[PDB]
Amino acid sequence: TNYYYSAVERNNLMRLSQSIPFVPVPPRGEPVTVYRLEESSPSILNNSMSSWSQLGLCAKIEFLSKEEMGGGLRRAVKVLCTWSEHDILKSGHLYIIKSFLPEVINTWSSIYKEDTVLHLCLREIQQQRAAQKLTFAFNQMKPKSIPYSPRFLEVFLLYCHSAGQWFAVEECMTGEFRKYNNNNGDEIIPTNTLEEIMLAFSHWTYEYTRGELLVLDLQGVGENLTDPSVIKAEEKRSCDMVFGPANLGEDAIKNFRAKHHCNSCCRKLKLPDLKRNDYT
Amino acid sequence: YYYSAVERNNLMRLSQSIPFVPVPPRGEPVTVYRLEESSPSILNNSMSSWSQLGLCAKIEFLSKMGGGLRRAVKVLCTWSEHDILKSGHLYIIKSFLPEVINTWSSIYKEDTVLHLCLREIQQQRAAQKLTFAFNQMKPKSIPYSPRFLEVFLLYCHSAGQWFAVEECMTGEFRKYNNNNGDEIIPTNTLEEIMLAFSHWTYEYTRGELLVLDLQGVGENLTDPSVIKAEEKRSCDMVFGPANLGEDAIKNFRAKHHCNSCCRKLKLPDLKRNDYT
Ligand SMILES: Nc1ncnc2c1ncn2[C@@H]1O[C@H](COP(=O)(O)OP(=O)(O)NP(=O)(O)O)[C@@H](O)[C@H]1O
Ligand SMILES: Nc1ncnc2c1ncn2[C@@H]1O[C@H](COP(=O)(O)OP(=O)(O)NP(=O)(O)O)[C@@H](O)[C@H]1O
Ligand SMILES: [Zn+2]
Numbered sequence: 438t439n440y441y442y443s444a445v446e447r448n449n450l451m452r453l454s455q456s457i458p459f460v461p462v463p464p465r466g467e468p469v470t471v472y473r474l475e476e477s478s479p480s481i482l483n484n485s486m487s488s489w490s491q492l493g494l495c496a497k498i499e500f501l502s503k504e505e506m507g508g509g510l511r512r513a514v515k516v517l518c519t520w521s522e523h524d525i526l527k528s529g530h531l532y533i534i535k536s537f538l539p540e541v542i543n544t545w546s547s548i549y550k551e552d553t554v555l556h557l558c559l560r561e562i563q564q565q566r567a568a569q570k571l572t573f574a575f576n577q578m579k580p581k582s583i584p585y586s587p588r589f590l591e592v593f594l595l596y597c598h599s600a601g602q603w604f605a606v607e608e609c610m611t612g613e614f615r616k617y618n619n620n621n622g623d624e625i626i627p628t629n630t631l632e633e634i635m636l637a638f639s640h641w642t643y644e645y646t647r648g649e650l651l652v653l654d655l656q657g658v659g660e661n662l663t664d665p666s667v668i669k670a671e672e673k674r675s676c677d678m679v680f681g682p683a684n685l686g687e688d689a690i691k692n693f694r695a696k697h698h699c700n701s702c703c704r705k706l707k708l709p710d711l712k713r714n715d716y717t
Numbered sequence: 718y719y720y721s722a723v724e725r726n727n728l729m730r731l732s733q734s735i736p737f738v739p740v741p742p743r744g745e746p747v748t749v750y751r752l753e754e755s756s757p758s759i760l761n762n763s764m765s766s767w768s769q770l771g772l773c774a775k776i777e778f779l780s781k782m783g784g785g786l787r788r789a790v791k792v793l794c795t796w797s798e799h800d801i802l803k804s805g806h807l808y809i810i811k812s813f814l815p816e817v818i819n820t821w822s823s824i825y826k827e828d829t830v831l832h833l834c835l836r837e838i839q840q841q842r843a844a845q846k847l848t849f850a851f852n853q854m855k856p857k858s859i860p861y862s863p864r865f866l867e868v869f870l871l872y873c874h875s876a877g878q879w880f881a882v883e884e885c886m887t888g889e890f891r892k893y894n895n896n897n898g899d900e901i902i903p904t905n906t907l908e909e910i911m912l913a914f915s916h917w918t919y920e921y922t923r924g925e926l927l928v929l930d931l932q933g934v935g936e937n938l939t940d941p942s943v944i945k946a947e948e949k950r951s952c953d954m955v956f957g958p959a960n961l962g963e964d965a966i967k968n969f970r971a972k973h974h975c976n977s978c979c980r981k982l983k984l985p986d987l988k989r990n991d992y993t
């Protein structure tokens with residue numbers, strides 16, 4: 438008069454009426470709020486307007502290291518991203534968090550009396566975005582014959598409740614981190630195509646902006662760069678020469694114009710010699 | 718080449734102060750745990766086991782709900798890791814009432830709420846495994862197919878407590894029968910099938926189990942009470958937290974009214990003698 442269940446079916450039902458093992462894997466990671474410098478036309482970056490996000494986003498980061506790299510105004514520390522709301526950051530990926538040295542703050546305190554650290558961070562990220570916009574124009578217009586594209590990492594603003602502070606965050610690059618040119622206007626002698634293109638990019642920024650801006654301190658791993666110095670070639674104000682906090686050498690633009698050596702890429706881009714006259 | 722004013726303007730704008738107003742995130746991040754199955758496509762022959770790795774989900778509060786032993790609030794899931802929950806979908810989050818936690822405070826030394834939630838979710842999975850079997854064995858002459866919603870375990874630090882979460886159903890929410898055996902009078906085929914289902918569970922399990930408190934929208938159900946019809950004590954009578962009267966079984970057998978579906982399923986009279 439029926440077709441009732443079997444042993445297996447009965448076992449699986451009765452087992453649910455009992456306590457079943459539940460071992461929640463321990464909670465590791467530090468909660469943070471991420472802010473992004475948005476773009477009006479991400480597809481045409483060089484014609485897009487930048488504006489800071491309003492509503493913060495949740496993310497979790499694993500502070501897996503105490504190793505603070507660098508000797509400049511900031512120190513970089515690697516962290517891991519467990520998760521990020523809307524995946525603004527990549528889960529299970531290493532990132533670098535950068536903060537300034539108290540000294541540096543104290544110095545800018547006399548300019549940024551309030552929320553010094555946050556302001557310096559806002560400027561650092563805006564500075565990198567400026568470099569990105571110039572590279573976007575560069576890759577877009579550069580001759581097809583050129584095989585390399587300088588690329589700057591995206592940098593986000595991060596606020597750590599636990600650490601009670603703001604940081605700039607970007608993907609951690611694995612590889613030989615090197616410098617093509619520096620804050621003194623000096624450059625390396627190229628050994629290959631990649632390096633020739635990096636060096637030519639700096640020359641190109643000066644020409645392209647009709648002499649108003651010079652991007653120096655090109656550095657990173659391969660084509661992927663970070664932390665450049667976008668210099669307002671003619672400014673004279675104390676701390677208004679570089680988009681972001683940087684220590685410029687003795688008359689860096691002068692040195693650059695005098696020491697830069699054009700290469701096969703510079704000529705491929707039709708750039709004129711820096712040593713020429715400004716007016717004549 | 719061409720270095721426009723718009724291009725120059727947007728570059729130079731980055732050298733100056735651009736307004737920044739840090740606004741705290743909206744909603745709250747929560748940790749979700751799932752009661753996994755070894756054989757989803759064959760749920761009634763599958764083993765249930767709790768997941769270990771809790772995944773994040775982002776929820777935003779919308780409104781509210783109360784019934785007997787729980788408080789419920791409707792929320793929006795805007796994003797979640799590996800889509801453990803569906804982004805852009807509505808969910809209902811439920812937490813136990815004071816009295817209920819105070820009733821199991823002795824039964825469950827520590828993590829009372831955690832266990833209450835675990836048992837509640839397990840109870841619904843049991844009913845689900847039964848609806849699965851039902852849909853497999855029922856005659857093709859029976860159209861509709863009852864189904865229980867999957868319930869997930871949730872942890873929220875904002876509130877510092879555990880909850881159960883499930884998809885929010887849209888439509889008129891109604892109860893077909895309850896824990897004391899009362900039944901609505903079926904006004905359509907679907908309600909008949911629902912009423913026939915509770916009877917089917919009893920017969921299918923050889924009088925060992927009975928699913929009451931059928932409720933939901935259309936053929937989608939939630940919040941059932943799975944009763945071990947042979948226990949002589951309420952304390953060990955229901956799978957998860959549930960309001961039952963020791964008269965439940967007897968009452969259901971006495972009150973239940975078989976319908977065309979019950980007959981379609983060839984179900985015997987619940988009033989009959991059990992040793993005959
Ligand atoms: N994206 C990255 N990936 C891997 N390593 C990095 C990355 N960025 C920086 N680093 C390393 O950490 C150090 C600190 O970087 P950074 O803060 O940019 O120093 P800096 O160039 O001296 N600038 P500053 O701090 O403004 O004076 C670098 O010299 C690298 O060795
Ligand atoms: N999945 C759902 N979708 C839409 N509404 C729901 C859902 N679940 C519950 N509700 C509503 O909220 C009320 C209370 O349900 P709930 O929070 O699940 O617990 P409850 O009060 O413990 N139920 P019960 O055990 O049957 O007495 C219901 O009567 C419905 O109106
Ligand atoms: Zn050159």
Ligand SMILES: [Zn+2]
Pocket residue numbers: 913916973974975976979984
């Ligand atoms: Zn019946």
